[PDB]
Design a protein around this ligand. Structure first.
Ligand SMILES: CNC(=O)c1cc(C(=O)N[C@H]2[C@@H]3COC[C@@H]32)cc([C@@H](C)c2ccccc2)n1
Length: 113
Protein backbone atom coordinates (compact mmCIF):
# COMPACT_ATOMS: atom_id res chain seq x y z
CA UNK A 1 0.00 0.00 0.00
CA UNK A 2 2.83 2.43 -1.02
CA UNK A 3 2.53 5.89 -2.71
CA UNK A 4 3.73 4.65 -6.19
CA UNK A 5 1.22 1.69 -6.09
CA UNK A 6 -1.65 4.08 -5.05
CA UNK A 7 -0.82 6.59 -7.87
CA UNK A 8 -0.58 3.69 -10.43
CA UNK A 9 -4.10 2.47 -9.32
CA UNK A 10 -5.42 6.02 -10.10
CA UNK A 11 -3.66 5.76 -13.55
CA UNK A 12 -5.30 2.31 -14.17
CA UNK A 13 -8.73 3.84 -13.29
CA UNK A 14 -8.14 6.65 -15.87
CA UNK A 15 -7.10 4.03 -18.52
CA UNK A 16 -10.33 1.99 -17.86
CA UNK A 17 -12.42 5.22 -18.26
CA UNK A 18 -10.63 6.17 -21.57
CA UNK A 19 -11.54 2.64 -22.93
CA UNK A 20 -15.19 2.76 -21.59
CA UNK A 21 -18.44 3.07 -23.67
CA UNK A 22 -19.03 6.62 -22.21
CA UNK A 23 -16.17 8.07 -24.39
CA UNK A 24 -16.24 5.61 -27.39
CA UNK A 25 -17.66 8.23 -29.87
CA UNK A 26 -14.32 10.21 -29.77
CA UNK A 27 -11.87 7.60 -28.24
CA UNK A 28 -12.09 4.91 -31.02
CA UNK A 29 -9.25 6.32 -33.27
CA UNK A 30 -6.82 5.79 -30.28
CA UNK A 31 -7.81 2.14 -29.42
CA UNK A 32 -5.15 0.44 -31.68
CA UNK A 33 -1.89 1.40 -33.48
CA UNK A 34 -2.29 3.61 -36.63
CA UNK A 35 -2.31 1.26 -39.68
CA UNK A 36 -0.47 3.75 -41.98
CA UNK A 37 -0.53 1.42 -45.08
CA UNK A 38 -4.32 0.70 -44.71
CA UNK A 39 -5.12 4.49 -44.37
CA UNK A 40 -2.78 5.44 -47.31
CA UNK A 41 -0.56 7.53 -44.93
CA UNK A 42 2.79 6.52 -46.58
CA UNK A 43 4.67 9.43 -44.80
CA UNK A 44 3.34 8.62 -41.23
CA UNK A 45 6.48 6.73 -39.99
CA UNK A 46 8.84 9.40 -41.52
CA UNK A 47 7.08 12.13 -39.41
CA UNK A 48 6.11 10.10 -36.23
CA UNK A 49 9.28 8.51 -34.68
CA UNK A 50 7.48 7.05 -31.56
CA UNK A 51 3.94 5.74 -32.33
CA UNK A 52 1.65 5.23 -29.27
CA UNK A 53 -1.98 4.05 -28.70
CA UNK A 54 -4.22 2.90 -25.78
CA UNK A 55 -3.73 -0.89 -26.49
CA UNK A 56 0.08 -0.39 -26.07
CA UNK A 57 -0.54 1.62 -22.81
CA UNK A 58 -2.83 -1.24 -21.55
CA UNK A 59 -0.15 -3.90 -22.42
CA UNK A 60 2.57 -1.89 -20.55
CA UNK A 61 0.27 -1.49 -17.45
CA UNK A 62 -0.60 -5.28 -17.46
CA UNK A 63 3.17 -6.18 -17.78
CA UNK A 64 4.07 -3.82 -14.81
CA UNK A 65 6.28 -1.77 -17.24
CA UNK A 66 5.30 1.65 -15.68
CA UNK A 67 7.26 2.38 -12.43
CA UNK A 68 5.38 5.68 -11.67
CA UNK A 69 2.41 7.88 -12.77
CA UNK A 70 4.74 10.30 -14.71
CA UNK A 71 5.89 7.45 -17.08
CA UNK A 72 2.19 6.51 -17.75
CA UNK A 73 1.20 10.19 -18.39
CA UNK A 74 4.19 10.63 -20.80
CA UNK A 75 2.88 7.75 -23.04
CA UNK A 76 -0.77 9.06 -23.03
CA UNK A 77 0.43 12.64 -23.91
CA UNK A 78 2.83 11.25 -26.63
CA UNK A 79 -0.28 9.66 -28.28
CA UNK A 80 -2.06 13.11 -28.39
CA UNK A 81 1.17 14.96 -29.51
CA UNK A 82 1.57 12.52 -32.49
CA UNK A 83 -2.04 13.34 -33.57
CA UNK A 84 -1.38 17.16 -33.33
CA UNK A 85 1.98 16.81 -35.25
CA UNK A 86 0.72 14.71 -38.25
CA UNK A 87 -2.89 15.97 -38.80
CA UNK A 88 -4.18 19.35 -40.09
CA UNK A 89 -5.98 21.13 -37.19
CA UNK A 90 -9.43 21.03 -38.98
CA UNK A 91 -9.47 17.16 -39.39
CA UNK A 92 -12.17 15.45 -37.21
CA UNK A 93 -9.46 13.25 -35.51
CA UNK A 94 -7.88 16.44 -33.96
CA UNK A 95 -11.29 17.52 -32.46
CA UNK A 96 -11.63 13.93 -31.06
CA UNK A 97 -8.04 14.03 -29.58
CA UNK A 98 -8.81 17.44 -27.90
CA UNK A 99 -12.01 16.01 -26.27
CA UNK A 100 -10.26 12.81 -25.00
CA UNK A 101 -7.23 14.86 -23.69
CA UNK A 102 -9.69 17.08 -21.68
CA UNK A 103 -11.11 13.88 -20.02
CA UNK A 104 -7.51 12.70 -19.27
CA UNK A 105 -6.07 16.02 -17.91
CA UNK A 106 -9.03 16.79 -15.54
CA UNK A 107 -8.96 13.27 -13.95
CA UNK A 108 -5.08 13.08 -13.88
CA UNK A 109 -5.13 16.40 -11.89
CA UNK A 110 -7.10 14.57 -9.06
CA UNK A 111 -4.03 12.26 -8.43
CA UNK A 112 -3.83 11.19 -4.73
CA UNK A 113 -0.92 12.83 -2.76
C1 LIG B 1 -4.71 8.48 -34.61
N1 LIG B 1 -5.37 8.54 -35.91
C2 LIG B 1 -4.97 9.37 -36.87
O1 LIG B 1 -4.02 10.14 -36.73
C3 LIG B 1 -5.78 9.34 -38.14
C4 LIG B 1 -5.35 10.07 -39.25
C5 LIG B 1 -6.13 10.05 -40.40
C6 LIG B 1 -5.74 10.78 -41.65
O2 LIG B 1 -6.18 10.41 -42.75
N2 LIG B 1 -4.90 11.81 -41.54
C7 LIG B 1 -4.43 12.56 -42.70
C8 LIG B 1 -4.89 13.97 -42.89
C9 LIG B 1 -4.74 14.64 -44.25
O3 LIG B 1 -3.43 14.30 -44.71
C10 LIG B 1 -2.59 14.22 -43.55
C11 LIG B 1 -3.49 13.69 -42.44
C12 LIG B 1 -7.29 9.28 -40.42
C13 LIG B 1 -7.65 8.58 -39.27
C14 LIG B 1 -8.91 7.77 -39.27
C15 LIG B 1 -8.88 6.43 -38.53
C16 LIG B 1 -10.10 8.63 -38.86
C17 LIG B 1 -10.17 9.19 -37.59
C18 LIG B 1 -11.24 9.97 -37.22
C19 LIG B 1 -12.27 10.21 -38.11
C20 LIG B 1 -12.22 9.67 -39.37
C21 LIG B 1 -11.14 8.89 -39.75
N3 LIG B 1 -6.91 8.61 -38.15
Amino acid sequence: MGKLSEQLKHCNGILKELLSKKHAAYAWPFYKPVDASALGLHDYHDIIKHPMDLSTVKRKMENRDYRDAQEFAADVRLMFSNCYKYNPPDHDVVAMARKLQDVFEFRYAKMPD
